[PDB]
Design a binder for this molecule. Structure first.
Ligand SMILES: CCCCCCCCCCCCCCCCCC(=O)OC[C@H](COP(=O)([O-])OCC(O)COP(=O)([O-])OC[C@@H](COC(=O)CCCCCCCCCCCCCCCCC)OC(=O)CCCCCCCCCCCCCCCCC)OC(=O)CCCCCCCCCCCCCCCCC
Ligand SMILES: CCCCCCCCCCCCCCCCCC(=O)OC[C@H](COP(=O)([O-])OCC[N+](C)(C)C)OC(=O)CCCCCCCCCCCCCCCCC
Ligand SMILES: CCCCCCCCCCCCCCCCCC(=O)OC[C@H](COP(=O)(O)OCCN)OC(=O)CCCCCCCCCCCCCCCCC
Ligand SMILES: CCCCCCCCCCCCCCCCCC(=O)OC[C@H](COP(=O)(O)OCCN)OC(=O)CCCCCCCCCCCCCCCCC
Ligand SMILES: NC(=O)C1=CN([C@@H]2O[C@H](COP(=O)(O)OP(=O)(O)OC[C@H]3O[C@@H](n4cnc5c(N)ncnc54)[C@H](OP(=O)(O)O)[C@@H]3O)[C@@H](O)[C@H]2O)C=CC1
Ligand SMILES: CCCCCCCCCCCC(=O)OC[C@H](COP(=O)(O)OCC[N+](C)(C)C)OC(=O)CCCCCCCCCCC
Ligand code: SF4
Ligand code: SF4
Ligand code: SF4
Ligand SMILES: [Zn+2]
Lengths: 154, 48, 46, 156, 96, 176, 116, 207, 56, 339
């Protein structure tokens, strides 16, 4: 809809800088906690054949060892220009899926760092007034722009 | 506002008001349009 | 007639961002822990 | 000097106790439940006003209907409302629980939780910001502060 | 600029008021009738008529991108002033 | 690329086995979790003192609605019904007719704040910046009826928040 | 030919009416404890009248495929009641307790509104 | 390449086109029509009797291996004699490709359930029945899944009104939630948005 | 960030990491809430020639 | 009447019935049902209330947006009464109380207040007026409750000549003090009854029938200036009725006789509390007052209502008194024939 306001990517960088420590503290409380392990280990085990045949996707597949991610196999937007790893489980239980999500929160910080360093300039919506509305400055001076603004919103 | 004060206009409220809900000054909605159909008013004069 | 100005990364990019797990290794060994535990009992029994 | 004065200060005490120890029973139904949790998060911390995060129906003093009420869920909402010890208040949070909202003209949405239970406070938004709900919770407190149960009893 | 009706009810800028035998005045008992006192039809009539030397003048409401779409007004009709369709500002031609 | 999260095989030497045995009996990893909560006790809480302190917002914030005027007292709305036609929730009702002076203005402009999804499309579609969403977000009511705004309520909101609405548009109209 | 069609359960009406009768039997025997489990305020008599009334309305049907669906839906309705998936409110939505009577004579409709 | 136009993928189009003929030649008994859209999506149109032979084939055949039921939905087109259109969206992890299999039915004609082929279809078929009224044969448990208990009608059919027929409120006389005929304080305002001028001459129908 | 060095030592020791370099509270490293006005780029179709719509 | 608010719709919640009704005493047992039926059809119901607003909340879900309007009033402040009746076309007076307070007594609530509402309504210009009285109303009865209604009933007919007075008998329902009162005697062991509950004949009427009758009288103009009497379809002995109540409740029943003078004495110590009295000297009189058989007054059947048998809807009221959830039928109470 609108371009990013000035001074936003600096705040995202400041936030992304400290978010790794936050996940660490989350893992200090749960990953190696024997109470957490006993309530998530060997619970909800799904086989790789049943997961596929039941319509599962995401961590419900990767939890059981299936190597599948639509960002790496069927990329969209600029996901093929970013580097990240896909965490894969071994046991297929609740504990292994909890680990994949935690690791995905790390790989997401990894992608954000690349996005901040590779953001290109330019417009933020298609320069085609028959699909995306024109800028309000144009809508108030150009007849064609005002016609397309009128139609795209009625 | 003590540094970059707001622009002054005639219609801006000089005195601000807080949430007036639950008080006699609350907002009661109503239609702001006038009656659409005008009925026929029979004559006040008898006949026969 | 100023130039374009939109939210862009500073010239040279941002500083590195840590993401890998960083759970440290703190404490004593299993041998030493049992030694201190047994040592307390013997002194206590005494 | 007058019984109206004595019965009025004793009324402030019960109003103050009920206003300062509201225990909600959030009916987390839809997206608005996310902004209700943010009200319990560290930044706003409803628990500091004496408002506990979560409680069971028979220990609850106020129901917060945060989300869309559907025809399949309406009978369950009234049952919990009935089983709530009095005094009991309801806070309607979000457009869906106020008048149906984005789903007003749907065949399965109740056009407002006020068709099912009485509502004491309406919090507008989609979703209301966690601070906007806290304004609604603090507005409910001034309602209890303004009650005159013992005054009215003394003049029957 | 309110024109309070004989029954003491304010007439809004759209001319809306309840008659005597109307049951919908009960909603205002113990409450008030929210009426905005700044009538836009009175404030725009007290704006000076600008004088210009060109037969055609452009109005964008002031502020540029913050105003209204730019329209061009014709001023060859001496019997009346040229009015903007968006903001109501009026324009007259100096002598010709 | 991919990485196994839980494929490590534990060591089976005497020292490693006696480390896990010590962990089981002496509860070492549980003590490690008590230290983390102890750390948070001595940190500064992230709680702001509402209502004396407010959470940060931005000029884009979509709050309560208002109807604006030009710097003359004249309304900006000219009853084009573009906002009415784009409202996803159909929360706007407009009726118009020539005014006494012949100007295209509304006789009804209702916003049902219980159907509204506070989405901003009405203020994007307005070609004269008449209808906007202000920064006010504290307008909770004790009755359902007084969240059904008519033209008078919206005009009063504009005349009440204009000092702040004008500054926000001034700070963000070069993006939109 | 075009009139040829894939059956649902019953290939003819005579086999279709067997399912209807089996469905009336299960419904007829479930009203007694449906009025007990739900703690309704209606006697079992008018409970079986309501079951009887619903069946009679779909009595002019002469298409086995239509009848099979009406039976399929009826058993779905019966299962919900037996397993108490329905609340007390759902079971009483057949009786239209709170709907005011709407007279069907011409003059009565003439005075109230424009509907036929 | 123009910056505002979606780039073509001629390699995918040729591959999916070939695989469409491959499926058509292996199942002449069922495949009625095969299409590849301008954005490279293969749609296989089959006879309703061939739901199990074709879904089972695409799931097992070594060159197909469509071992994931992405979605299963119906589309209501009243103008058609068979107003319903059952759409199966299948995914293949082995070949990183997707296919769509479409069949048809009407109100009274059963369609064989695909639960034996994909266990994912258990709830998808309940939704199609609940919302569209299509009955699925040999289904382990067929019921309403999304609608209120005792709800009469199938909401997603094009002839079902948006606001339904009944609405709920609490009634103090009977101390329960009751259902009454629908009345709306504000009627939904029907907008006629269609422009009278043709927009896509490429899709023009004969006179 | 106002904690005395002693309390900082205690929290750092218990957690196991230096918490003072990665505080979860923001003080002054955040962008100023008032920023200079922008001037956004224009799209590829903002040309006065060779820009017929039927070619894009 | 050049306005004559015109009905619109199908008679549903969002419809318009054209009735602008002020319902005094709408916060009680009878008010809940009257307001519910009015708002269930689309009526503009003004509810003047004296209690705290928290006690009017159950009345809010009974109408569409803006169809229920709440006002403050004082029984002795004629200005407040006028504010709530000046815009209306029908006034309903459901005000009453079973006991006397220091501020208000039977004269105040049954004579002085009802007369003020009628007098203010008459000059305000209200065309209709519904007033509720008691079936056993006479100026020669032991009960001061029933004596005052007869005195106040005539003032309404003399201040608002066209008013419609309705004289229901005891009403039973979920929130009633008639069948719930009988079932709550169990806290004191046996069930005292003057005589042995004999020599008393009562004709209880259902709450909804009284409500539908009040609503019908607001529609048909063949009730202006009339006087009705709402009575049930069957007459029962008081002993039989109480035994039936305890049979439905499924609780021990140990009735014993008690002299009238002794019953009052226990009825005076129970009216010393400054809260809802459990029983009163006046309340004991009304339980044992045989219901009149006025046959010259039109009843429910004339207004289009069919009296509901008590056996049909007695479990509805007495269900909560049963101590077991399900409890696995009670024989009908012996009814006095018609002869
Ligand atoms: C157990 C021992 C408790 C020690 C007392 C607390 C304390 O001294 O902490 C400050 C300080 C540690 O606190 P900090 O978190 O690092 O400081 C954060 C800010 O600088 C501190 O924030 P600040 O700079 O804004 O400080 C202002 C604050 C400063 O307030 C204080 O200094 C607290 C001192 C309390 C004594 O002023 C107040 O708010 C006054 C409020 C008083 C609250 C009541 C506390 C006393 C209750 C005693 C029971 C009732 C009798 O003291 C220490 O260095 C360690 C304390 C433990 C060793 C105690 C040895 C004696
Ligand atoms: C006060 C609580 C401070 C918490 C400090 C946390 C910490 O430093 O953990 C270090 C360590 C963390 O241990 P660990 O579980 O991470 O593993 C240590 C073993 N190796 C080195 C192989 C990884 O915790 C301890 O060493 C605590 C020792 C046991 C103390 C409890 C004894 C039993 C209770 C006796 C009665 C009292
Ligand atoms: C209250 C909490 C529950 C009771 C426990 C209270 C005692 C708290 C134990 C804290 C242990 C500790 O000191 O942890 C921090 C310290 C880390 O130091 P370090 O090993 O250098 O880490 C970096 C290495 N790369 O780790 C250490 O160096 C550990 C040194 C202390 C060892 C403690 C004694 C061994 C514990 C096992 C014996 C248990 C029986 C002890 C007798 C109890 C009765 C008094
Ligand atoms: C102490 C044991 C020890 O010091 O290790 C000796 C030897 C070396 O062990 P390693 O080569 O690492 O691999 C296992 C080989 N069996 O490992 C061995 O040969 C010992 C293998 C058998 C050990 C059995 C243990 C039985 C339980 C008693 C535990 C004793 C340790 C607890 C006390 C700790 C010290 C206080
Ligand atoms: N219910 C019965 O068994 C019988 C009822 N009736 C008649 O019906 C009417 C009452 O019915 P019911 O619902 O049972 O009575 P309730 O006890 O349930 O409620 C009485 C109503 O009158 C109001 N009231 C009492 N005193 C005052 C006062 N000084 N000022 C203002 N309001 C007052 C009360 O308001 P609040 O409590 O909020 O202060 C309340 O709304 C009476 O006319 C009665 O004679 C006749 C036959 C049987
Ligand atoms: C005597 C019988 C037992 C009761 C004991 C007396 C205390 C009862 C009142 C407590 C609630 C209260 O005081 O509330 C908080 C009040 C503010 O209330 P306000 O807004 O000024 O209320 C004005 C009228 N209202 C209620 C209609 C708005 O702060 C105080 O003044 C508290 C200081 C005195 C505390 C003494 C404690 C002993
Ligand atoms: S009001 Fe908005 S946020 Fe709340 S449930 Fe509805 S759509 Fe979601
Ligand atoms: S914010 Fe969106 S939903 Fe609300 S009135 Fe504007 S367009 Fe409608
Ligand atoms: S508010 Fe704006 S978009 Fe809506 S009718 Fe008025 S001028 Fe048009
Ligand atoms: Zn202009």
């Amino acid at each position: 809809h609108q371009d990013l306001p000035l001074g936003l990517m600096d705040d995202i960088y400041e936030f992304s800088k400290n978010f790794s420590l936050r996940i660490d503290e989350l893992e200090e409380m749960l990953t190696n906690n024997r109470i957490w392990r006993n309530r998530t280990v060997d619970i909800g085990i799904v086989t790789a054949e049943d997961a596929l045949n039941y319509g599962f996707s995401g961590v419900m597949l990767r939890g059981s060892g299936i190597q599948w991610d639509l960002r790496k196999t069927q990329p969209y937007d600029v996901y093929d220009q970013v580097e990240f790893d896909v965490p894969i489980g071994s046991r297929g239980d609740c504990y292994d899926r909890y680990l994949c999500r935690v690791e995905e929160m790390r790989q997401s910080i990894r992608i954000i760092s690349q996005c901040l360093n590779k953001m290109p300039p330019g417009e933020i919506k298609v320069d085609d007034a028959k699909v995306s509305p024109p800028k309000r400055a144009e809508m108030k001076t150009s007849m064609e722009s005002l016609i397309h603004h009128f139609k795209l919103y009625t | 506002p003590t540094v970059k004060p707001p622009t002054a206009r005639k219609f801006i409220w000089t005195n601000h008001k807080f949430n007036l809900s639950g008080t006699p000054q609350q907002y009661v909605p109503y239609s702001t349009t006038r009656k659409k159909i005008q009925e026929w008013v029979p004559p006040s004069t008898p006949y026969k | 007639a100023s130039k374009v100005k939109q939210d862009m990364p500073p010239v040279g990019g941002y500083g590195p961002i840590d993401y890998k797990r960083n759970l440290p290794r703190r404490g004593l060994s299993g041998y030493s822990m049992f030694a201190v535990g047994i040592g307390a009992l013997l002194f206590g029994y005494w | 000097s007058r019984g109206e004065y004595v019965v009025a200060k004793l009324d402030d005490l019960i109003n103050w106790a009920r206003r300062s120890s509201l225990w909600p029973m959030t009916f987390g139904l839809a997206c608005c439940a996310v902004e209700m949790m943010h009200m319990a998060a560290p930044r706003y911390d409803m628990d500091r006003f004496g408002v506990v995060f979560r409680a069971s129906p028979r220990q609850s003093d106020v129901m917060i209907v945060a989300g869309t009420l559907t025809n399949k869920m309406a009978p369950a909402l009234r049952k919990v409302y009935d089983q709530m010890p009095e005094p009991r208040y309801v806070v309607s949070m979000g457009s869906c629980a106020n008048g149906g909202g984005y789903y007003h003209y749907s065949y399965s949405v109740v056009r407002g939780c006020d068709r099912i239970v009485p509502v004491d406070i309406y919090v507008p938004g989609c979703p209301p910001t966690a601070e906007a709900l806290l304004y609604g919770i603090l507005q409910l407190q001034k309602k209890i502060k303004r009650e005159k149960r013992l005054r009215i009893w003394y003049r029957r | 600029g309110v024109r309070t009706s004989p029954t003491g009810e304010k007439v809004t800028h759209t001319g809306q008021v309840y008659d005597d035998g109307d049951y919908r005045k009960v909603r205002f008992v113990g409450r008030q009738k929210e009426v905005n006192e700044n009538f836009a039809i009175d404030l725009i009539a007290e704006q000076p008529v600008s004088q210009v030397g060109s037969r055609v003048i452009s109005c964008d409401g002031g502020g540029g991108a913050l105003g209204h779409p730019r329209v061009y007004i014709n001023l060859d009709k001496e019997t009346k002033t040229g009015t903007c369709g968006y903001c109501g500002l009026q324009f007259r031609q100096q002598h010709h | 690329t991919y990485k196994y999260v839980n494929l490590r095989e534990p060591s089976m030497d005497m020292k490693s086995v006696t480390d896990r045995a010590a962990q089981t009996l002496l509860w070492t990893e549980l003590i490690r979790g008590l230290g983390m909560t102890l750390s948070y006790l001595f940190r500064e809480p992230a709680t702001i003192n509402y209502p004396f302190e407010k959470g940060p917002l931005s000029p884009r914030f979509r709050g309560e609605h208002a109807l604006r005027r030009y710097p003359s007292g004249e309304e900006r709305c000219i009853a084009c019904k573009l906002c009415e036609a784009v409202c996803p929730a159909q929360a706007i009702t407009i009726e118009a007719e020539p005014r006494a002076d012949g100007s295209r203005r509304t006789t009804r402009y209702d916003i049902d704040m219980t159907k509204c999804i506070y989405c901003g499309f009405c203020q994007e579609a307005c070609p004269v910046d008449a209808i906007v969403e202000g920064p006010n977000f504290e307008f909770s009511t004790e009755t359902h009826e007084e969240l059904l705004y008519n033209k008078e309520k919206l005009l009063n909101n504009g005349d009440k928040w204009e000092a702040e609405i004008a500054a926000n548009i001034q700070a963000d109209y070069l993006y939109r | 030919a075009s009139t040829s069609v894939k059956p649902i359960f019953s290939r003819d009406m005579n086999e279709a009416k067997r399912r209807v009768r089996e469905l009336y039997r299960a419904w007829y025997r479930e009203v007694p404890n449906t009025v007990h489990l739900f703690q309704l305020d209606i006697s079992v008599k008018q409970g079986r009248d309501k079951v009887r009334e619903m069946f009679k309305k779909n009595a002019h049907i002469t298409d086995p495929r239509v009848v099979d669906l009406l039976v399929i839906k009826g058993k779905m309705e019966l299962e919900e009641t037996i397993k108490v998936w329905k609340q007390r409110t759902h079971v009483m939505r057949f009786f239209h307790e709170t709907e005011a009577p709407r007279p069907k004579d011409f003059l009565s409709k003439f005075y109230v509104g424009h509907d036929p | 390449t123009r910056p505002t136009v979606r780039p073509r993928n001629d390699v995918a189009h040729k591959q999916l086109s070939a695989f469409g003929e491959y499926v058509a030649e292996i199942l002449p008994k069922y495949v009625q029509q095969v299409q590849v859209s301008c954005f490279n999506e293969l749609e296989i149109c089959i006879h309703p009797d061939g739901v199990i032979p074709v879904l089972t084939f695409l799931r097992d055949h070594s060159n197909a291996q469509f071992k994931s039921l992405a979605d299963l939905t119906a589309v209501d087109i009243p103008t058609r004699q068979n107003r319903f259109e059952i759409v199966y969206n299948l995914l293949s992890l082995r070949f990183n490709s997707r296919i769509r299999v479409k069949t048809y039915t009407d109100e009274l004609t059963p369609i064989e359930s695909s639960v034996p082929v994909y266990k994912a279809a258990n709830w998808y078929e309940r939704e199609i029945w609940d919302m569209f009224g299509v009955f699925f044969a040999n289904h382990p448990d067929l019921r309403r899944i999304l609608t209120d208990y005792g709800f009469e009608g199938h909401p997603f059919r094009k002839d079902f009104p948006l606001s339904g027929y009944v609405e709920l409120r609490y009634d103090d006389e009977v101390k329960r939630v009751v259902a009454e005929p629908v009345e709306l304080a504000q009627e939904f305002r029907k907008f006629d948005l269609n422009s009278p001028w043709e927009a896509f001459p490429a899709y023009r129908q004969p006179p | 960030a106002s904690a005395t060095r002693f309390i900082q030592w205690l929290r750092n020791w218990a957690s196991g990491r230096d918490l003072q370099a990665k505080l979860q509270l923001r003080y002054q490293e955040i962008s100023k809430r008032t920023q200079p006005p922008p001037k956004l780029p224009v799209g590829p179709s903002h040309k006065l020639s060779n820009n017929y719509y039927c070619t894009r | 009447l050049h306005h004559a608010v015109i009905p619109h719709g199908k008679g549903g919640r969002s419809s318009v019935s054209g009735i602008v009704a002020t319902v005094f005493g709408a916060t009680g047992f009878l008010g809940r049902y009257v307001v519910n039926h009015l708002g269930r059809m689309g009526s503009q119901v003004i509810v003047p209330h004296r209690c705290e607003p928290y006690d009017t909340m159950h009345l809010r879900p009974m109408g569409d947006l803006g169809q229920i309007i709440f006002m403050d009033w004082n029984g002795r402040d004629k200005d407040s009464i006028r504010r709530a009746v000046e815009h209306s076309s029908v006034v309903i007076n459901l005000v009453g109380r079973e006991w006397e307070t220091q501020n208000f007594d039977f004269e105040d609530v049954f004579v002085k207040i009802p007369q003020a509402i009628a007098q203010v309504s008459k000059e305000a210009g209200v065309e209709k007026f519904i007033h509720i009285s008691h079936l056993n109303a006479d100026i020669k009865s032991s009960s001061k409750y029933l004596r005052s209604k007869a005195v106040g009933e005539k003032e309404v007919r003399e201040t608002f000549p066209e008013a419609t007075i309705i004289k229901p008998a005891e009403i039973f329902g979920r929130e009633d003090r008639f069948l719930n009162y009988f079932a709550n005697i169990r806290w004191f062991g046996g069930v005292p009854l003057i005589s042995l509950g004999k020599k008393t004949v009562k004709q209880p009427v259902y709450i909804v029938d009284v409500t539908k009758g009040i609503i019908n009288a607001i529609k048909d103009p063949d009730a202006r200036g009339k006087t009705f009497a709402f009575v049930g379809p069957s007459r029962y002995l008081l002993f039989d009725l109480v035994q039936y109540v305890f049979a439905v409740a499924h609780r021990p029943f140990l009735p014993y006789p008690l002299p009238h003078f002794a019953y009052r004495w226990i009825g005076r110590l129970f009216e010393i509390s400054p809260f809802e009295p459990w029983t009163t000297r006046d309340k004991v009189e009304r339980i044992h007052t045989t219901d009149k058989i006025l046959p010259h007054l039109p009843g429910l059947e004339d207004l289009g209502v069919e009296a509901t048998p008590l056996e049909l809807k007695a479990i509805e009221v007495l269900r909560r008194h049963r101590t077991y959830r399900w409890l696995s039928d009670v024989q009908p109470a012996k009814t006095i024939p018609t002869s």
